[PDB]
Amino acid sequence: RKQISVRGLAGVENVTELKKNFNRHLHFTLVKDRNVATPRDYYFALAHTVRDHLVGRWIRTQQHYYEKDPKRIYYLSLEFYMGRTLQNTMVNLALENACDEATYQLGLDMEELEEIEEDAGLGNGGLGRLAACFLDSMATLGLAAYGYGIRYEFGIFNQKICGGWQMEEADDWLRYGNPWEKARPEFTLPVHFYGRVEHTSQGAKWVDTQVVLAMPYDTPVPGYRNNVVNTMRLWSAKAPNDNVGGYIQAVLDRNLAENISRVLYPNDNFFEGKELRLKQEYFVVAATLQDIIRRFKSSKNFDAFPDKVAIQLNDTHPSLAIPELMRVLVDLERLDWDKAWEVTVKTCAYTNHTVLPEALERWPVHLLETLLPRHLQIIYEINQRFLNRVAAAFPGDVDRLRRMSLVEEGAVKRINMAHLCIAGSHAVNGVARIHSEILKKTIFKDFYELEPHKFQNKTNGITPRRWLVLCNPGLAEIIAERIGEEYISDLDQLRKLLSYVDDEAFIRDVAKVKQENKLKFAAYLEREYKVHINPNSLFDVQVKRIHEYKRQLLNCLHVITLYNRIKKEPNKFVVPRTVMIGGKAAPGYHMAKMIIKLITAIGDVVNHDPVVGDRLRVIFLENYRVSLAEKVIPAADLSEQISTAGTEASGTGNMKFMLNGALTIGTMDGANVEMAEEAGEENFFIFGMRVEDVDRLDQRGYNAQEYYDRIPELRQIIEQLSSGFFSPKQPDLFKDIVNMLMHHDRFKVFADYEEYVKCQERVSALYKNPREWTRMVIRNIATSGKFSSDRTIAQYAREIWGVEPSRQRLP
């Protein structure tokens, strides 16, 4: 427990001070005493005690940036998937052992207290979590960086499983308050909606608008033991300051404006063109850019703006920053268009995260005209000048003009926000090598040919603080025992572990740590859900949002295959497996909801077959979220990363599993390709179509029937699904799944079935050899260094932002 050296020192005076301040907060802050105090009270007492330790550094860091006047980095995102904050703060401030000891002396288990904290679940998955890892890395690398987003009252919904189906409940994460945020109502700013444009004496004027106030809440972002504490600023919607029925209703109607920040849109990789979403996007953009402009002016004429400001667009969601910056510079600051545009492009950079056409933002022009009339005007002017440049570069190429235009023609005329982003940014990057290459090759080929220098790659990463030191201290410890602690903010040092592939002690310890994590996760499921899992089974884990492209269905086909093979040959030994699948489906995503039901339905049969017993178990992990990822990933043996080649832009869950001692079964997709490159393909369970094979199938037409006709075992499974074998009380329950698989499968599940099953056989074969399993694991952990988000951020800093990262400690 405390034996773990990476968790820091429990200094005698520090422990004494912590206990004193713990008790002080219990008394003065919580207004409790030990007689009526609950574990929740004790969590809050600890949270406040720990938060106090951030204050000095937080003030000093922000003063430091004022004095040093570095270029400031503004990371704009609609999502920040932060998770819990207590343990992270302790780790980054080197207080974990001290607080553990302090709480122990008070008769409390700190780990029990940590479980009280709600996730800040202000994101959907990978995109939101990337933003969170990025904040952590930017602070650790000493960058003057500011996360900007929306403080949703309700984050990603809490998932309940009832009758085998997903049920959604409001994520009321602020119910007991957030001890980490500091409300800043004094720095509230006005955001404008609707209205109209007057073109007059000085120029254009946006008038007759409806105002929504943006109230900022600042959350500290501690760097790893460098005394840096940066800021995440999240905006909250507030109704503007200024008959009985009339009056009362008028007060109640304040809710309408305040609804802007009420709830996170729960879609992963899907664009839903709701007006409320558009308001949210403009809300963050307008308030944020006001802050940026104010800070710029309070630092020493807009020529130096791009020298002192970088705006990073987390996908196109804050793309309105481009026309908003132009609006402020032209309409308010009175710069000429050309200069303002020069400034804007040098300030802004765009990160693309998605490949699926339905995930791209294309807003109807009518909606933009009504809500943001001046922005639409500016977008049209941007388009005219941009297409003039295309026309000059490629004279007579009319189709290219049509393809590149920010304006999409059709029944409903729309603005392509990705096109706007490329036009208005000096850099455009994808999120893994394969993805960034395909951007230049197909998706934005025309833009790449116009401005090749714009296009970059920044392979994603994860923070080794949250995703190793916090969630897997046992693994962190056995590593530090061999190579010291430098790797925690220099993850490439993990390559030193290749020297221990034949080290008996290290082989022993790696396996020991994994088993400890598996026991702990089994204890979690037993405690929280009364679900029993076989501790001596292979933990086969697919955790990620439920999506057709991510192919949970392919996993389902394999699970049924294992079941059917057992039933055909009950006497034949098979490596016992616990197959775990978890993830949320978007509320409006019918197929994803059906897929969850199929997983539970498969479990209903498999988990109660006496011939199978504990040899195979299929469980659906309820309410997959950051806090759960921190529990299950360190317990995983096999990481399922089985998206159709070309569909997962990068993935980040893949990296978490690799860092935490799981072996990977995956396609050559997203960052899987680079992970396999780093480790050596011999150390990865790579299977299935490459992108080239998918394209060849698309060329001739994907016919699922061919695979059904040629694979007896697949045929059996489909017939089980169709006939009601997995839904005897409702035989036709899965007809939609069967129909999609047979006739309308965009993701070619059947095409990878045979290779997947065979690859899984090789997984089982290696697991039968514990020594060699663990040695391959070592080869994975040791080469996961590239996938630190420190590496990613250092690249953003040097290649896009023009700032030099620094691990230098503040006084």
Place this chain on the structure above:
Amino acid sequence: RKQISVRGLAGVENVTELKKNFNRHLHFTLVKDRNVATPRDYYFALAHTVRDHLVGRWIRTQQHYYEKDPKRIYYLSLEFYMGRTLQNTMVNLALENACDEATYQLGLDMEELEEIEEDAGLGNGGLGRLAACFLDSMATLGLAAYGYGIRYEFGIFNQKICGGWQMEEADDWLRYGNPWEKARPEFTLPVHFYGRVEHTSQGAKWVDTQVVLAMPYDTPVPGYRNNVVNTMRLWSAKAPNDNVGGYIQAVLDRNLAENISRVLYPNDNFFEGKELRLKQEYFVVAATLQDIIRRFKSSKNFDAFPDKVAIQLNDTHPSLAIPELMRVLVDLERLDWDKAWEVTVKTCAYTNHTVLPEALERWPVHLLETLLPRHLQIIYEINQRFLNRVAAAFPGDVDRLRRMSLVEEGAVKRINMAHLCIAGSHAVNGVARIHSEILKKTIFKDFYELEPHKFQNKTNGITPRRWLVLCNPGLAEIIAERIGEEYISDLDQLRKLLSYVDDEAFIRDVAKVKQENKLKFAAYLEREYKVHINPNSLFDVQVKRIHEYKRQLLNCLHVITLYNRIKKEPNKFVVPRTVMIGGKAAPGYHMAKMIIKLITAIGDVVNHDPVVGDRLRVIFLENYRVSLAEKVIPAADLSEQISTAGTEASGTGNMKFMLNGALTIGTMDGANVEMAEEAGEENFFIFGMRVEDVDRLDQRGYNAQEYYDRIPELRQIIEQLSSGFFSPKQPDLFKDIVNMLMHHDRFKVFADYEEYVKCQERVSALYKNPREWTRMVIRNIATSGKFSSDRTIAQYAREIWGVEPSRQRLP
């Protein structure tokens, strides 16, 4: 400043500690340093520092009640007009001088900091303010007392005057947070609405309900220097725990339930039968009674309930407590009806505050059936048994049965909540002697004849902490200089001041203090509104909610009379006056809004007539509220208390003026009668019809025309109003006022005009003699002791609650 001894000691170590804790809060709580810190930051730093001093006493007091197990007093109100808390806390904890010194040493003016605090304006006027004074007195008298109400997000609206008209703005009092409250989400309770009744095996069951959660916020209520800190618990509405459009809308629709605690209904003396108001009333009642029941059970079978619980109903607004208690005792606790009813009546007591029929609560039975079906059933059963008692007591008296029934017949069948309250309470009281007498004489004569022992008087009071020591420390000081400090919680000791009616020093000092207060108020108007007032004028003040019965219009007639008399005889000396009128009109109250416009319109003419100059000025005091009352009342020379005899149940503003060195012009109405009795009528400017005279006019019919025909000066004014003299750009602007006065005046303004004007002449005559004015003032201050809310509460305690008050200090 600090010379003021009543403000306590500035102990050296105390000042040192306060400065240290001030700076600590600025750093750790506010996350600021002296470079960026605003006066608001400094206010909050002081607020947190002062609040810390309540904590020990607050915990100790509540533990004391658990140990001592006294009878607990629950004061249920829909309104708590608390005002600001910073100064009050300092006064009651003897910290004012210490904090003044501490802040001074830090380079800050504490009075400037105090002005930053928002009023907790969770009431309309007198009723809400009475509740607030009562909380203060109950803590000062060492009673185990709990205020229970609703934490409105928006209190009484902020009043703006624009173009001479009232404009309403949302009172966003929680914008910067409330440092005084402690959120208790852990003690959240479910409140049920709608649904239906099942009568089954065990009995009746309320099922299929919609749930709204009640989250409590506790606010400390310090007694005067007795180390007692009681609790005001205010409930906040929270939505219960458990397609894309569908999901998002479902989350947004949480606002509907949460609207229950959104806004205070802004009506003074008017019943508006809105469903939302009914929900608010049940919301407080249901959550509160759950608390009461829980505390009762956690203290040592329902036989002892009335021995350990008192429920005081602040008017009929929480009247649902009666059927709710019956519901819990019968349906949930399984007591037989008779026993439950015995318990209920002994537990509950009802205070009636209003005389006007339109202020009485009469809820349509259809609304009660839909919203609270089980409560309606219980009400009907209460009615049947109660009328059985009436029938037994008065055999054959069928009309009495009809008159006394809780059920009112007609086109819309309604429940009379006052009747329910009398039936279900062991005590019923009015709020001044005249009012309590008329309850037994007319309004509830039938109930008085049935149960005379139920009927009591409890003349209202005001706290001499807020209403003397806080708002008028200069007066508090000159009093303490002669008689010591005991009077602060023993106000009857002010009678000792009668010994100083001929004391030259005291006459000098009383007049000096008044002039100081007048200078300060003039400085306030100049600073905040750039309005200049004549410091050497009589400050003639009518501050109270705008109501026809309160007769601001009569004041208007007198003001115009003064103006017209000056114009007729410009050379004749008149005592210079500044006539100040302030108060909010209910948003839906057209006549009240017109009256505000008339006051400003009169000012528009009078204040700009060069013949008048500074001899007469008429100003409308914008946004009258508790904090403003604390400023203007100590500056007042003349207190306008001019309600039609029989219409003001008590009044409390009257008492504030008397305590603060103003002489009173008033009718024999409400507590005015007792005030004049205490001081001697020779020391009051009493004028106009007595109740007997009003009744005689009602008997023959009020004909306003008679007065118009007989009073030339009145005729002139009405013709000025009709012809557009006070609205030249809109000649007919005041036609509705004129029409009401001439043909539909329920409050007989014309009937008191002549006596009012003549009485005002006598006011001016006495003001010409400063010595004799001040001597009469002394005679008023010295006899204001009866009107301490300590006296009132001691009476409630002994005569209704069955508890003995105690000024005993806690350790």
